[PDB]
Amino acid sequence: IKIMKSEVLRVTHELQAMKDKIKENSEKIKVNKTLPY
Amino acid sequence: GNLLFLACYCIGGMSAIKPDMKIKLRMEGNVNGHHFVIDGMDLEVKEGGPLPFAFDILTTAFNRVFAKYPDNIQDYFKQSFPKGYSWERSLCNARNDITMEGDTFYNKVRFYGTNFPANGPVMQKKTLKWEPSTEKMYVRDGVLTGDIEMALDFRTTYKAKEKGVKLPGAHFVDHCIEILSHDKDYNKVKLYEHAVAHS
Amino acid sequence: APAVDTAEQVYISSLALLKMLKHGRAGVPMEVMGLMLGEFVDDYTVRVIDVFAMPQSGTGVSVEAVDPVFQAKMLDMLKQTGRPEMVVGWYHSHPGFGCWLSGVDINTQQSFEALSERAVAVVVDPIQSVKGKVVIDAFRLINANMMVLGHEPRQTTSNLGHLNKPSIQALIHGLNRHYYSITINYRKNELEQKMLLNLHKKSWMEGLTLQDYSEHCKHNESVVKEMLELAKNYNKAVEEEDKMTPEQDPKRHLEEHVDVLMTSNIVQCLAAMLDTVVFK
Ligand SMILES: [Zn+2]
Numbered sequence: 173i174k175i176m177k178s179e180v181l182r183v184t185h186e187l188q189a190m191k192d193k194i195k196e197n198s199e200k201i202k203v204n205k206t207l208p209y
Numbered sequence: 210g211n212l213l214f215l216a217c218y219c220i221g222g223m224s225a226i227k228p229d230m231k232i233k234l235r236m237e238g239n240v241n242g243h244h245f246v247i248d249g250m251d252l253e254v255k256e257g258g259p260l261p262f263a264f265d266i267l268t269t270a271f272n273r274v275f276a277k278y279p280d281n282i283q284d285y286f287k288q289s290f291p292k293g294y295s296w297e298r299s300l301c302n303a304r305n306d307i308t309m310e311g312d313t314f315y316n317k318v319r320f321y322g323t324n325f326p327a328n329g330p331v332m333q334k335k336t337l338k339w340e341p342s343t344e345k346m347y348v349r350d351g352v353l354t355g356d357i358e359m360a361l362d363f364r365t366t367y368k369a370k371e372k373g374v375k376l377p378g379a380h381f382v383d384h385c386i387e388i389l390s391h392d393k394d395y396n397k398v399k400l401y402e403h404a405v406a407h408s
Numbered sequence: 409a410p411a412v413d414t415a416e417q418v419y420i421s422s423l424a425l426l427k428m429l430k431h432g433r434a435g436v437p438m439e440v441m442g443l444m445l446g447e448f449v450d451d452y453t454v455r456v457i458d459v460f461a462m463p464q465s466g467t468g469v470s471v472e473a474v475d476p477v478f479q480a481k482m483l484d485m486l487k488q489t490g491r492p493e494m495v496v497g498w499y500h501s502h503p504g505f506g507c508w509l510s511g512v513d514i515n516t517q518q519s520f521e522a523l524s525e526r527a528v529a530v531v532v533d534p535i536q537s538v539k540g541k542v543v544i545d546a547f548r549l550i551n552a553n554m555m556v557l558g559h560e561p562r563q564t565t566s567n568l569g570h571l572n573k574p575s576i577q578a579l580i581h582g583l584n585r586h587y588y589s590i591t592i593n594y595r596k597n598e599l600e601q602k603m604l605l606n607l608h609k610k611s612w613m614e615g616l617t618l619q620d621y622s623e624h625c626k627h628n629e630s631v632v633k634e635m636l637e638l639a640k641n642y643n644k645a646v647e648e649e650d651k652m653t654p655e656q657d658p659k660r661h662l663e664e665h666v667d668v669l670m671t672s673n674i675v676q677c678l679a680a681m682l683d684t685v686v687f688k
Binding site for chain 2: 467470471472474476479480495498510511512513515516518519520522523581
């Protein structure tokens with residue numbers, strides 16, 4: 173439980189960081205995929 | 210049936226070049242009824258021909274230029290560069306935007322207004338001059354608010370893109386803006402933007 | 409009214425030039441840009457001590473490509489490291505377009521000059537910078553009122569500002585009309601030059617390693633055969649010299665082959681025997 177709760181908190185924090193990482197990836201992909209193809 | 214024909218060939222040469230994209234310093238507005246747009250410091254109205262109102266109502270909304278400050282007074286206008294400063298002007302409200310539309314660096318000074326009186330002094334095109342006006346510049350809530358009295362209220366707010374520049378103390382900058390040269394139709398205008406800071 | 413002297417120079421450091429070239433190439437075919445840090449030592453000097461790149465944006469190279477957060481944080485943390493130099497100017501790469509300032513380039517340079525009257529806008533062509541020559545220039549501006557009044561953009565007091573001639577490509581794109589070129593000098597101290605010397609400093613070993621002896625013999629055979637053919641041609645040409653009053657040379661090629669033979673074999677012999685007698 174205790175080590176398993178620690179694993180739960182670890183995984184939720186890495187998700188929290190990876191969400192904004194995905195947001196940044198989408199931002200730069202729109203930065204390069206602009207429009208005048 | 211027994212055609213078996215050869216084939217010729219006519220090429221078409223094709224090429225072009227994007228030139229140095231040209232910055233058009235144009236302001237837009239719909240203050241009372243007309244979507245006036247002006248290019249510009251010589252002023253020339255692009256669309257929205259001879260204005261139903263006087264020019265002065267919009268002459269106060271005119272980056273790349275800043276008032277002259279002494280060494281004692283911190284020049285928030287100057288150190289905010291290279292990015293520049295974006296301001297909200299309340300007269301009718303005015304905002305300056307920087308956009309990348311088309312192949313023109315757009316320095317919009319987008320104008321907007323409401324509550325136009327049916328006989329207000331701004332539409333009969335009467336005008337004497339703009340007497341020198343002192344703007345008291347001070348920080349309210351982290352925003353550089355300049356309170357100026359209009360003589361012929363102004364609640365200017367200046368925000369730097371570099372949100373790290375220190376805010377200058379409350380000072381009193383004297384602006385002297387007057388319509389130097391123009392025509393009766395007000396389509397070929399030259400404006401004056403002289404203004405110096407005073408502590 | 410004060411006028412910028414034509415003797416003013418831009419002293420780019422070795423590190424700044426290398427970083428600028430590397431960043432300019434890394435972004436080809438796009439146009440990359442960044443801020444040059446340094447100091448305005450005096451009225452005739454602009455020292456570019458260092459330059460840091462800036463993240464690529466879809467805008468291109470404009471005054472909207474300088475992210476305020478990036479610039480501010482980079483400056484703060486460099487100051488922490490020990491590089492508290494002001495933003496002297498900006499640089500961007502014109503890949504294959506030569507060195508000049510476009511309308512938008514002139515625009516961003518006006519923005520930078522509003523920050524400080526002295527501010528340079530050096531540009532670098534990263535694909536024209538083939539080994540040897542480096543295609544890079546630095547321009548400030550000319551005030552429109554200065555030019556329309558008829559006065560020259562820059563006062564002259566020496567021959568320093570005219571040792572190099574302006575290029576046609578820059579001139580058509582507005583040189584000496586809206587912006588003036590500033591002479592560029594490279595600040596390379598002894599330490600940096602000696603450090604760079606290690607790039608091709610061979611070794612203490614290859615001074616002592618003999619050529620592959622079979623390869624050496626084969627090279628000798630080939631060059632001696634070529635030299636034989638050249639000697640035949642030389643004899644044939646010299647026979648013509650007699651029946652010809654003063655009126656490729658089989659001789660010059662012969663001399664070049666002779667020189668390469670003697671240098672190769674002398675070096676190989678000496679290295680071999682030095683090896684025989686230093687290694688027991
Ligand atoms: Zn450019």
